[PDB]
Amino acid sequence: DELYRQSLEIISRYLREQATGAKDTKPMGRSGATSRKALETLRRVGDGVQRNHETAFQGMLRKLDIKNEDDVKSLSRVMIHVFSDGVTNWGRIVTLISFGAFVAKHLKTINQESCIEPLAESITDVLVRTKRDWLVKQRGWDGFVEFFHV
Ligand SMILES: CC(C)(C)c1ccc(N2CCN(S(=O)(=O)Nc3ccc(SCCC(=O)Nc4ccccc4)cc3C(=O)O)CC2)cc1
Numbered sequence: 001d002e003l004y005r006q007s008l009e010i011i012s013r014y015l016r017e018q019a020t021g022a023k024d025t026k027p028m029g030r031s032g033a034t035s036r037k038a039l040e041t042l043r044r045v046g047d048g049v050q051r052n053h054e055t056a057f058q059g060m061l062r063k064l065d066i067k068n069e070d071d072v073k074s075l076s077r078v079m080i081h082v083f084s085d086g087v088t089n090w091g092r093i094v095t096l097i098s099f100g101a102f103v104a105k106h107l108k109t110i111n112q113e114s115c116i117e118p119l120a121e122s123i124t125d126v127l128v129r130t131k132r133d134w135l136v137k138q139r140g141w142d143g144f145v146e147f148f149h150v
Pocket residue numbers: 060066072075076077079082083092095096097099119122123126
């Protein structure tokens with residue numbers, strides 16, 4: 001599925017870039033022009049959310065204590081249910097991705113870099129399994145870039 005593949009492309013690249021401090025220069029797939037604009041957006045908005053909500057993110061990180069792939073697996077099963085409840089908006093979706101980047105930075109600190117790709121997959125699974133129809137209706141990643149346009 002195309003939407004899953006493009007979402008994972010953006011989400012995995014943003015989480016790994018936040019954790020390592022280096023950009024991925026490997027080519028993107030079809031819709032690469034949109035994925036580059038989505039990453040430019042996440043570098044502005046996602047970095048901003050992590051800074052402005054640092055104390056809440058630290059509290060959530062400390063309580064969840066994600067330190068391995070099994071932790072990511074267990075948490076993704078419950079978060080598919082939690083993320084399905086309540087209103088859907090681009091603010092909620094960028095906060096999920098921003099929290100993923102916050103966790104990815106912590107995983108690099110505890111020498112668990114190998115857990116960033118499964119984390120990006122679970123973030124993508126949570127997002128696409130619960131919001132597929134909303135994402136499609138809101139013009140997908142083009143809609144995301146348009147909503148946060150400066
Ligand atoms: C990849 C994986 C490791 C699986 C993963 C996936 C998701 C997350 N979650 C969820 C998404 N957020 S959010 O900040 O985007 N958004 C939220 C943050 C907070 C809240 S307040 C209410 C949560 C609560 O206390 N429920 C609660 C408390 C006790 C019992 C039952 C329910 C709700 C949301 C929201 O979107 O529903 C971050 C934390 C973490 C890790």
